[PDB]
Amino acid sequence: STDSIVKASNWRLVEVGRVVLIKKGQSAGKLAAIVEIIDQKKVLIDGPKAGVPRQAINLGQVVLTPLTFALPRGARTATVSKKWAAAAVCEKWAASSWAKKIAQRERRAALTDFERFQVMVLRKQKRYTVKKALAKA
Amino acid sequence: AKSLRASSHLNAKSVKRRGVFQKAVDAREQRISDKLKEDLLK
Amino acid sequence: VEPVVVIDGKGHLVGRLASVVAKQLLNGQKIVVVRAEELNISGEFFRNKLKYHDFLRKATAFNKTRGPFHFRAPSRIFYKALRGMVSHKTARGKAALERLKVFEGIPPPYDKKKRVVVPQALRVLRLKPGRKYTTLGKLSTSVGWKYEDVVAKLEAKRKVSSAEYYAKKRAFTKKVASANATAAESDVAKQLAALGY
Amino acid sequence: MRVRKRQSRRTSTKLKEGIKKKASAHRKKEKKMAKKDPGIPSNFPYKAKILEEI
Amino acid sequence: MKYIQTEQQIEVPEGVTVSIKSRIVKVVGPRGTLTKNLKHIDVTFTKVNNQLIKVAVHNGGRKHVAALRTVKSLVDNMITGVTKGYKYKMRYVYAHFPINVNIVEKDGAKFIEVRNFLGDKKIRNVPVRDGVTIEFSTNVKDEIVLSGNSVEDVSQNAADLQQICRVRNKDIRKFLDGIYVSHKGFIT
Amino acid sequence: MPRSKRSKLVTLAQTDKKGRENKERIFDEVREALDTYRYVWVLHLDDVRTPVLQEIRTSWAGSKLIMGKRKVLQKALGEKREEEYKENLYQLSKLCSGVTGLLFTDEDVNTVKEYFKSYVRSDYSRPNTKAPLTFTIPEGIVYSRGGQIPAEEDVPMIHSLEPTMRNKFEIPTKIKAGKITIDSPYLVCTEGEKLDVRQALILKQFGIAASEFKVKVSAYYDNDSSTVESTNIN
Amino acid sequence: AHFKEYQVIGRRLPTESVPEPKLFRMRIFASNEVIAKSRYWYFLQKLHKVKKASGEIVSINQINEAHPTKVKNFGVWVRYDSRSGTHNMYKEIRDVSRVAAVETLYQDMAARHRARFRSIHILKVAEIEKTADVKRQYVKQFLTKDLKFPLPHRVQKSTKTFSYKRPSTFY
RNA sequence: GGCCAGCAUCAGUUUUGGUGGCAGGAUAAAUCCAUAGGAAUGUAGCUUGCCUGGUAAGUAUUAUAGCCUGUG
RNA sequence: AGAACUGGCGAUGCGGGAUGAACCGAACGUAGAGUUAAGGUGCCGGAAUACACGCUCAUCAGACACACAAAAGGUGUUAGUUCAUCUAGACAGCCGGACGGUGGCCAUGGAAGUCGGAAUCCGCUAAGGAGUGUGUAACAACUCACCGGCCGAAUGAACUA
RNA sequence: GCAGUCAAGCGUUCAGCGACAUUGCUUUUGAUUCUUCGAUGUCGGCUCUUCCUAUCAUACCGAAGCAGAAUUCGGUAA
RNA sequence: UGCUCCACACAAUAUAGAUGGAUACGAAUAAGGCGUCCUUGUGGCGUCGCUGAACCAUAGCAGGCUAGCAACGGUGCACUUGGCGGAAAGGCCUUGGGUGCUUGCUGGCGAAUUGCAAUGUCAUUUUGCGUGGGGAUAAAUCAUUUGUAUACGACUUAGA
């Protein structure tokens, strides 16, 4: 074909309205929305729904999530919070496999010893059925 | 004078080898093969 | 945690990999390095060749035989680099070095064993984009290594065999995953999901 | 290919002391020999305000 | 200053298509096809309207911008060669000893043979690179035309052909015998 | 550029850039002539030999011809009605597109237009134009004039320009002892063909001034009437 | 340490028949009150014949940023006396607050010109009111509509010494 | 009664966490609500050219987004 | 070099600067616990391949004393200072003009701007310098200082770190 | 070496310092040189190993009136 | 009647140091793994990383004696069928049944006294005496002797 099949080269771009997850500091594990850009390495974020106060944070401590929503440039806390509810980014993040894995690991860390024994018994029961299915096809 | 590691002399020797030089060795080996086969045929 | 750790030398840095392996050996963790011929060193090829030639120029004037030994194989180059960071002259250093094995390519039985990498020593992660680098195999060949062609054929054969093995394993894992997904939605599956599994 | 010798970078503390003494003498010599504004920078967007204040 | 992002525009004519991998660039068109491995350049490609491709470097320095520009130039050269092609005309001049040029064939290498240069008995063989065809000109006496799709291959072949007839140890101010590239142009 | 930048080719020439002073002087001169003369004309002379320009200028000593940068002349005449020097003068300035060109004279309009219609002079090929007629170099020794006149009157080409013929004009020339020779007849142009830069340069070197030229005037402005008229005589 | 802006005032001691001194005021960037007072005294001594022993500090108050959550463009007067004689220097920094801008300016000066804190004097720090007044390209670049760019070559910090995944960077 | 240890609660030295109540800042500044104005890296709408429903530039200071200044 | 004051070494262990009479730290009984100096935290080597901003690709950088070689030079790099041109179209790219008195005066076999010596005067311009360079015996021709036409917007010159 | 000129620059606050160039120095007709004046301390040689390029020659090149031959300088080269 | 291979029978010997499993495609990092569709390609779609905080296994006197239910699976062991592996293969895949366990599910019996913990002994590297079971009965050196050799050492042949 004559079309330019050249790869699209998809990239997670940092932009106004992008929602990111903080991986360090007191606000670790909380979502924040980028409001404005300070420089090539520093950005302004606001996560009032997540409870993180507005502050300037280096991109080194921030990882960009695939989710994005429209935010006017320089939007204050009230506007950012309103757009957060309008876009329902929290529900989309929860439905994402990343949040599912985070919640799964968090629950695993808190599992009780009796809960651990129950998990082992359930895993054995599931394995029994799974191996019964195998060799029968 | 030119040494063994002289590129021009080595190239000339290689060209000579591709010339009748290698054909002579090929003919010698072909002749030797006949006697090698005769050693078993006898 | 594993009794023996296999590290793939391809794409790694000589200095960082040697330092981490030396530190691990001193702690008692046995380590074996494979595919050392694919190891990389920072800087362009000419600088590494110049440094290797300068090192080779060192010899004992009155008796060349007993002077420094300039090993040409990539594995021995890595071994010398690691030994430079280890007090091999002591009994503890000798014991630590006995836990280390270095090979070019992946000879058996290591070809059948899992291979790991050191994130803090990867060339890609550490070296800035655009920075030039030199391959240990090319340097070894330029400095007298003659087994470069022999290793390539064995590496290709091992790659083909492992590709067939993975062709089998991918189908097996796909079948296992399909069976597990079919088993999903069961009471045991729901309980495991609610319990984090 | 036949790399020549490289200059050693060892300190050679004898040179340390020699250089220390030479620098001490040179500082005294310079001290003895001693006895014998740009305004408003350009490109400033609000440079006019300085003139207004003046 | 490490510009945030700089990009250049590459124009793809309707007659050719250019499929590009991570960094492997392939060009296909009426005259032929060409390939180039640019994995060492670390640049990005992106289609916009199926006829123009933008190559951009994010957080790239001055040297990175220069590399982007030369990548664009190489892509343009490949496109032109695929569409129009390149035609190199070489002329050999002799004063007393006629220069005999023939395209001999051995093992399919197709070496260009030059004989009797300045009366030398040595036979000079210039291998023909891939993708370049050499044909003796007609109606233009003492001229040989080299044509091909890749600029680099044809240019290197012409350079080697002219260099093989180097005049050694003689005064260049008097000995004008040699082979020179008379003119460079497109096949079309 | 901290370094690795372009270096200007400094030469010890006597002339220096005139600068904005010349532009201001021409602006003032244009605004003065706009009122000093009864009529204004816009002459679209893309290119002309300096002797021809001087001959045109001296053709009527009782008139002034103003030229220079097109933008300066447009600004002097005015770019918009809000600032035009004279009523409807913006319309006249809008019409200038080529290498203008501004003539101020009190002479009769009919006389000026008739003179411009009748005036004609020879000119070079001026590439980007259809060739006047075909020309072929003789299939032998090449002379200075290309053999247009009998070869007995012509002179062989000087060897100094042979490299110019080869590299620039792109003609397979070879050097002979006393002459420059070509093995086959070389056609430089054909009737009705678009003249390329190399062909035009070859024709100029051979001195083939077969092309005619006449100045192009797009319109004239009557200062007394203060109305633009689009006279388009060739 | 992290800089702070202090309002330092001096009322060089009132001698007989000269009560109510002029009460000179200054804005000093410093990590603590002591350093701010020391710099204020040094500047006062440099400007005129006053001295620390001849005067006293009226009041020291920290000037907090009015809008520490707003992105602003700052123009800073820079004068440093090293290595050669003092010369004017102007730099533009994009930052959320004046203190952050001053910290970045000092860090950049130390990185490039090797000028130390004691060797740098800050004359004026002014917020640029409107866009297009910024002159330096590296600041005007970010002042573009819908500015978006990627972060290629993402690197993940590994807590473990060994990794079985052969980590890949994405993209 | 001889040798070695653990547990409980104590005195001195000492190291690392959790947490509660207070005095100071511009009686923190922020965030946020109300209020009068301003602007564009101009929101909705309107206008000019294109036309594959939107597009490039003029308008329009809050409208089918918001931002900044001062005050309470 | 000749003097005055002030410390250490000698008689002095200990930690650090790899190695030491002068360098830094430092109050020498035998012991236990704790906190530090100077020096360090990739291994040898006990301690973060810690966090943040930049700087350098070196075909023997750098971790080297602050002093001799050292005055400068790099179409190697990053940031600054001072001057210029700019939609009366900035720099650089392509095409045209580059005139006429005139082939200006001395010599000359040849000397037309470009082998040599004094001038280096004036008209028309947007501009043409008794000529920036290549070449002809001689012009011719090519080209540059400037200007003109096409695109369009920042560009150029000297310095400092 | 000494004695002077000029300043690209630095600069008692920009009078003084000062880079690159430059004049006087120590029989113009290849003519002579028949001066060749004190080392208070050794130098010079038989066998034999290595190393440096600041390269005499061999090797590969550029610039020189390099027509050839032949010769000069320069780049790498132990 | 020595030697050599196997089983246990007990010892001596030490462990650069078990105390679940070293879990196997290759390549790039300005890119990739998996599933799917076709026209099988440098094609389209969905999905995933952002660490191994993973996957398997992990319940019973250091892991017993038994009574049942659901499947014809899972798993240790000796045979057995064929195939693959030479870079240090010294290992890997798999048919057939045979014999134990199966905590997948549901009951019974016993644990104690080591007294409130004392690693609380559970693995192999080697060596010998013993039996029970399979296999065959050799060379070198010293000395003499020839020299292709040599100070002596050393080297090379010959002699039931």
Curated annotation (Swiss-Prot), chain B:
Present with 6210 molecules/cell in log phase SD medium. Belongs to the UPF0642 family. It comes from the Eukaryota. The lineage of its organism: Eukaryota, Fungi, Dikarya, Ascomycota, Saccharomycotina. Residues 1-11 have a biased composition (Polar residues). This is UPF0642 protein YBL028C. Residues 1-20 are annotated as: Disordered. Transmembrane segments: none annotated. Disulfide bonds: none annotated.
From Swiss-Prot, chain C:
N-terminally acetylated by acetyltransferase NatA. There is a cross-link at residue 175 (Glycyl lysine isopeptide (Lys-Gly) (interchain with G-Cter in ubiquitin)). It is found in: Cytoplasm. PROSITE patterns: RIBOSOMAL_L13. GO terms for molecular function: mRNA binding; RNA binding; structural constituent of ribosome. GO terms for biological process: cytoplasmic translation; maturation of LSU-rRNA; negative regulation of translation. One of its GO terms (cellular component) is ribosome. Its main location: cytoplasm. Keywords: Acetylation, Cytoplasm, Isopeptide bond, Ribonucleoprotein, Ribosomal protein, Ubl conjugation. Component of the large ribosomal subunit (LSU). Mature yeast ribosomes consist of a small (40S) and a large (60S) subunit. The 40S small subunit contains 1 molecule of ribosomal RNA (18S rRNA) and 33 different proteins (encoded by 57 genes). The large 60S subunit contains 3 rRNA molecules (25S, 5.8S and 5S rRNA) and 46 different proteins (encoded by 81 genes). Component of the ribosome, a large ribonucleoprotein complex responsible for the synthesis of proteins in the cell. The small ribosomal subunit (SSU) binds messenger RNAs (mRNAs) and translates the encoded message by selecting cognate aminoacyl-transfer RNA (tRNA) molecules. The large subunit (LSU) contains the ribosomal catalytic site termed the peptidyl transferase center (PTC), which catalyzes the formation of peptide bonds, thereby polymerizing the amino acids delivered by tRNAs into a polypeptide chain. HAMAP family: Ribosomal_uL13.
Swiss-Prot record, chain D:
Residues 1-43 are annotated as: Disordered. Present with 7130 molecules/cell in log phase SD medium. Belongs to the TRAFAC class YlqF/YawG GTPase family. It is found in: Nucleus. It comes from Saccharomyces cerevisiae (strain ATCC 204508 / S288c) (Baker's yeast). It comes from the Eukaryota. In contrast to other GTP-binding proteins, this family is characterized by a circular permutation of the GTPase motifs described by a G4-G1-G3 pattern. GTPase required for 60S ribosomal subunit export to the cytoplasm. Residues 1-13, 21-34 have a biased composition (Basic residues). The gene is NUG1. This is Nuclear GTP-binding protein NUG1.
From Swiss-Prot, chain E:
Belongs to the universal ribosomal protein uL6 family. This is Large ribosomal subunit protein uL6A. Component of the large ribosomal subunit (LSU). Mature yeast ribosomes consist of a small (40S) and a large (60S) subunit. The 40S small subunit contains 1 molecule of ribosomal RNA (18S rRNA) and 33 different proteins (encoded by 57 genes). The large 60S subunit contains 3 rRNA molecules (25S, 5.8S and 5S rRNA) and 46 different proteins (encoded by 81 genes). uL6 lines the binding pocket for eukaryotic elongation factor 2 (eEF2). Its main location: cytoplasm. GO terms for biological process: cytoplasmic translation. Component of the ribosome, a large ribonucleoprotein complex responsible for the synthesis of proteins in the cell. The small ribosomal subunit (SSU) binds messenger RNAs (mRNAs) and translates the encoded message by selecting cognate aminoacyl-transfer RNA (tRNA) molecules. The large subunit (LSU) contains the ribosomal catalytic site termed the peptidyl transferase center (PTC), which catalyzes the formation of peptide bonds, thereby polymerizing the amino acids delivered by tRNAs into a polypeptide chain. It comes from Saccharomyces cerevisiae (strain ATCC 204508 / S288c) (Baker's yeast). GO terms for cellular component: cytosol; cytosolic large ribosomal subunit. One of its GO terms (molecular function) is structural constituent of ribosome. The keyword Ribonucleoprotein applies. It is found in: Cytoplasm.
